[PDB]
Write a protein that binds this DNA or RNA. Sequence first.
RNA 1: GUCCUAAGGGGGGCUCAUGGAGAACAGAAAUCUCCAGUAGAACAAAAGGGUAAAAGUCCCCUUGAUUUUGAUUUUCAGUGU
RNA 2: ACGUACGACCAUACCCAGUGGAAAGCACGGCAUCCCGUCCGCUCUGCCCUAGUUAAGCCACUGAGGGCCCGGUUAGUAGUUGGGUCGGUGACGACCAGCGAAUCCCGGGUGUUGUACGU
Lengths: 188, 286, 169, 65, 129, 266
Amino acid sequence: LPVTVEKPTPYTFDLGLLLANDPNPVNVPKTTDTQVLEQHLASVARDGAQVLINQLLTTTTITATKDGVLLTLPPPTTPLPREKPVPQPKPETKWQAFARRRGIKPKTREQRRNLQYNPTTGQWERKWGYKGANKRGETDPIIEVSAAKEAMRPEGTSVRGDKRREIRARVKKNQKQMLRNQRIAAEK
Amino acid sequence: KLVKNSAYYSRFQTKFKRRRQGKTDYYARKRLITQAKNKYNAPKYRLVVRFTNRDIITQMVTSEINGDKIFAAAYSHELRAYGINHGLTNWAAAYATGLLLARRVLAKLGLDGEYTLTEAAETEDGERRPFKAILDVGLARTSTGARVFGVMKGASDGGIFIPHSENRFPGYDIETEELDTEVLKKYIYGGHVAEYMETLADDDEERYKSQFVKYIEDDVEADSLEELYAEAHKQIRADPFRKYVSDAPKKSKEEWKAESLKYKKAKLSREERKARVEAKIKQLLA
Amino acid sequence: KAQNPMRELRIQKLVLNISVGESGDRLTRAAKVLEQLSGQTPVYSKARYTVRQFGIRRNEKIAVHVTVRGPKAEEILERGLKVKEYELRRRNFSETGNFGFGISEHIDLGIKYDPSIGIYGMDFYCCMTRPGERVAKRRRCKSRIGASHRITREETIRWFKQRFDGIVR
Amino acid sequence: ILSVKKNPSNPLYTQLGVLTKGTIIEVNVSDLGIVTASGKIAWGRYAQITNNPENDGCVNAVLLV
Amino acid sequence: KVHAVSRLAHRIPGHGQPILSCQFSPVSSSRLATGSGDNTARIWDTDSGTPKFTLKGHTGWVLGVSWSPDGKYLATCSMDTTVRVWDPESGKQVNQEFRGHAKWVLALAWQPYHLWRDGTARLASASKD
Amino acid sequence: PRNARSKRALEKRAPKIVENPKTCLFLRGTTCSQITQDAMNDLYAMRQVHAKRFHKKNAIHPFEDATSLCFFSEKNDCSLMVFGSSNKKRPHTLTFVRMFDYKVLDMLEFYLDPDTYRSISQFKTSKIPIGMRPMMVFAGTAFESPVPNAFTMAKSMLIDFFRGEPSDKIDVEGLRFVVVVTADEPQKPILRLRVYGIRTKRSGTRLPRVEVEEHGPRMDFRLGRMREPDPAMLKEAMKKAKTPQEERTKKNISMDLLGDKIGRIH
RNA sequence: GUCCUAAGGGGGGCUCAUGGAGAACAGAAAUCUCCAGUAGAACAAAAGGGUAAAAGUCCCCUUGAUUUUGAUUUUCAGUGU
RNA sequence: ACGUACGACCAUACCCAGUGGAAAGCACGGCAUCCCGUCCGCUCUGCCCUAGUUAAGCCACUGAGGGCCCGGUUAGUAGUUGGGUCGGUGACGACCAGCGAAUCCCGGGUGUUGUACGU
């Protein structure tokens, strides 16, 4: 018994999706006999599966690894629609446009690290974040206070929250700028 | 107010049947069966380990769409064929059950006409790959010295590739990150149970007799457990498919069908239900 | 079927509670009282919500309790009923079969007075169960205790009568 | 020498590739025969220069292991 | 047909010093002998990956282990100028240690089983002297 | 997206150069026959890993309004939908609906033949493991029509349904189930969906002999109502993104077998 | 105005708001015990079907605060490792 | 047919109560040396499978009250698109069609099923 079939029009294959297209007509018998109908359908299915396994075992590279015997498949060729549009570059923000105009180069990853060496303590510390350098002295035992600055200081406030106040102001300004950028990008 | 009203019963959404029965952790099951590092379309096997009061159940399971399939199964009550009649739920019996399942899997695979596509596409530089499966403990707590790891240790010694570490074996020391293989050997050959028998025979004779009445009745001393378990391992590795018959009553399948149908209570039909409804209506009228 | 040995009433757990309501030295002394009375380390309980009237805040340790099982629970319950002269009220018993009471001083129970500690009162709560309560507590195949297996108020009162020889009013 | 990873004094010195004391460089360790846990061959590692090449005429380094 | 080993079966600790020699039993792979620099040799049951015996008595690094061709004896040669013969099924030393080498004993060679005569076995030990 | 988990969900639902495997939502209308529910169960069993199922009744007519379908695509991140319906004109209908950018790309109705439908449980054979992608065979003359029609779009939707996950390698043991769709040009032609298991037998030759055994389900459809995509949306869906690992060929620049960049002079 | 071995990740255990019945102070509201509790709590988003041996809440480990390589994609580079 | 272990549908399976259960298996159970974990060996973990017991879990049957699931009817009907095609200057009134409900009502039901090992 053979393992190769003969048809007037040859099969076409897409081994990326494990797909076989048989353009020959399926001569379905014009009867109501279910078992011979399913026999003919199973014969067509058997022919398609046979030629598909033959193509996989012949035109694909076979590699035996510890996982098992693998066939290397080509990338798929049958066109199928995407579920989402192809991503596009985001619209340039105000800073990105200004840097492109002024030739401002992006900072390197080593340069933008959250780490610096404090000489006076002789230790390594963070510039920002938890226990960062931007909040230096909020937990210090003794803080020098200027007399004029303390006189101009409002009642109830202390020197220990001035750095947090400046951080809140800078965060508010950065947040307003990024909200403006998001609104402009939404309009665009 | 009544919380269990018509709105509550209509809005109520039942869980899965096995979750209601408290037998399946579906959150862990989904990651066990539908998650793979590689997408090579390969079948996956799991060693399912379960424990009862009197038995240990070990199965080799694949997951299909209409229900799971059992490739091979081993039970702790089958160790009576290999000479173990007492302590069928201890850690050594867990090891023996896992070893028996591993040997049965290898014997079924032939690693101890129709043919495979692997043999069809095998190349010249091809070697035999070990059989691989993942451990399924279910709802059991995976602590140090648990018997699910004894089953897994027995199967891995028997020849099934189960990916695992050694920090949950009995004898592992957590601060030194080392495993005491003397304690592991003692647990494999049942030295913990033997030490328990000696300690009870020295301290509390009555508790010794009550706990090990079957051991004294069958004349199984503490010092014979190591040689007994090694001897049982030798026959497990020799003949993994040895038939064992129990002391339960033996009948054929049709005889058991008749015996259970004799004790079935039949469901009453529509005519009987209508007759009972009419009788209840007549009783209410009278 | 009520004569089955598996339906025998027994003490599941006795819970000893002291709610001082204020964190600090009083709570630590109550914890030490619980430790010396039971033999095991107690449990500190935190306040769930904020109540300005009671002077408590959220996540503040205000109470302490110990759960005791076995014959030690029976001994402590015997001491408590010796304090309460084996007399209880029908209000004390619940419909779930559990009961409880409370004492005003730990000294009369059998502990010598220490001026460094002081005087503390306690709440005793006894929970009753029949054999078969593992079904509703075990991790695998947890289910519901059957209706016939549940312990009623009359059953636990009758058990209290026949066991502690007490009176209910 | 494969590359200069970090000159401790200045990123400009790191970019220019200056070999001084304390400099972290990347070295080819094929001859040392280092195999990773996965079976891969480690052929590039980090070394710290422990001498002054400008005064000594040679570069001496210690592997960071 | 022998299939290629592809994975770790068992990693068994127990030796306090680097292992200098290893050899399986000729009967089967279930018994393995390792002689190490901790002045000892060890017999391992490899089916369960467990130790079985610890042969002690040498005062130097056990430079060689060698099973008898019938498998009933194990010979260990060490840096203490001695060769010891052990019963592997009991872990006990047979007779006394062999004396007469001036320096380090480096290699052992059992006589083949078909050449044994006079109701005894012969063992050749090659030494640094 | 304050939390890292919500950020992970947003990044997973974000558009990508290479897309995630498409998710299929199985849902039914107010009227849905038991045959249609069994067919939906069989299709879910075929596609368990990348599907979600609704369990309530939805008063939605898909060819009249699809705003609720767009909302469900937005919420569940599902790009395929199988919608069950029943009616006097159409007794058992499966509406295959494909999205693009959370809007309806195309729609196609299948009418089930009820007297010939066989469930998976009615075949007493070994079944497909969970997570295994089956191979596909499309047979007949109805799939190579020069004009895009209902049969071509049905072929595209069935390919996208039984596509599974893409893979550059496959184990030879994962070539054991085949899904065959047969349809012929012509009164209405019948699209027949069958699933078979594959047995291999020695034939005295290196190539094995393939033998089939019926796995189920057995489905017969008549193609029904038809919603073609918008042209611009169709080109936007058929745009093929380029992987960053796919290099652009430069003139007279190549890479040799050792990885050195090589220039060509003339 | 204060406090934090930071967030995050992984694994394990537990079930919430509320109602009823009880327990010296304790009395609508403190704590504890049982029963019933589709989530009616909490966490995110803005469901027309989010989450219950969890996506909630407590324990253990990491906390290393933005790793390495790339002949590949985009942009840039008179300081092109 | 019954039981157990993994399961597929995920209430026809859920909420409440009563009755029965041969065989075996589950399960309740007994003891805390070792492994292990808690305030508490309650849970988890280890050891025993001997002894008690079907009381509960589990299974089957029944009973109400709910809930839930099918099929017909509603009904090709309301409603919505169409001068669509006839009159009406037009708007619209019929007719022709395409899509197409739900309430009410009637009848039935209160779980099927795969693998493996046993009774």
